[PDB]
Amino acid sequence: QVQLQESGGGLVQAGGSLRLSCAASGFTLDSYAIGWFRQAPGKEREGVSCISASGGSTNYADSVKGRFTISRDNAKNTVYLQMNSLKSEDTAVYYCAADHPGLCTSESGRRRYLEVWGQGTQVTVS
């Protein structure tokens, strides 16, 4: 019942934009850090971005710095990944994750970590 669901994937030309949504259900993400990952074809899972519980800290993989912006809307229980200036190599399945050790949060805190994973939304950049 705790669950993450991604949307916003699409088919776009190089240089275009998308906004991915990571929507929580069965629980509120308000106090949790959220990360985005992707799997490009024939590649290992790549960390894309994360945002801290407060929203005050954000991380980006070097390859997407300046192009992608992560943000959170607690009221909508959703975290967004705005993707501008899309490139061919941004083509991948993208999925989010909530409350994992070292993912824009402490690597070991007191709390048991939720470690929720989503399902995926697909980005194709032609």
Describe what you observe in this structure.
The protein has about 130 residues and is mostly beta strands. It has one domain: Immunoglobulin-like (Sandwich). It is about 0% helix and about 45% strand. The chain contains no helices and 11 strands. It has strands at about 5, 10, 20-25, 35-40, 45-50, 60, 70-75, 80-85, 90-100, 115, 120-125. Strands 2, 4, 5, 6, 9, 10 and 11 form a 7-stranded mixed β-sheet that branches. Strands 1-3-8-7 form a 4-stranded antiparallel β-sheet, with no helix packed on it. The N and C termini lie far apart (about 35 Å). About 30% of the residues are buried. Keywords: Adaptive immunity, Hydrolase, Immunity, Immunoglobulin, Protease. One of its GO terms (biological process) is adaptive immune response. It comes from Camelus dromedarius. Pfam families: V-set. InterPro entries: Ig-like_dom, Ig-like_dom_sf, Ig-like_fold, Ig_sub, Ig_V-set, IgHV.
Based on the model shown, name its key terms.
126 residues, mainly beta, Immunoglobulin-like, 7-stranded mixed β-sheet, 11 strands, 45% strand, immune system, monomeric, Anti-HCV NS3/4A serine protease immoglobulin heavy chain
- How many domains make up the coordinates? 1
Strand content: over 45%
Largest sheet entry: 7 strands, mixed
Query: Which architecture per CATH?
Result: Sandwich
N-C termini distance:
36 Å
Radius of gyration: 14 Å
Order of helices and strands: EEEEEEEEEEE
Query: What is the number of strand segments?
Result: 11
**CATH class label:** Mainly Beta
Count of separate DSSP helical elements: 0
CATH homologous superfamily, by name?
A: Immunoglobulins
Summarize the amount of helix as a percent range.
under 10%
Overall structural class, as computed from helix and strand content, comes to mainly beta
Provide the CATH topology.
Immunoglobulin-like
Overall spatial form: globular
PDB class: immune system
Keywords: immune system
Assembly: monomeric
Entry title: Crystal structure of a nanobody raised against urokinase-type plasminogen activator
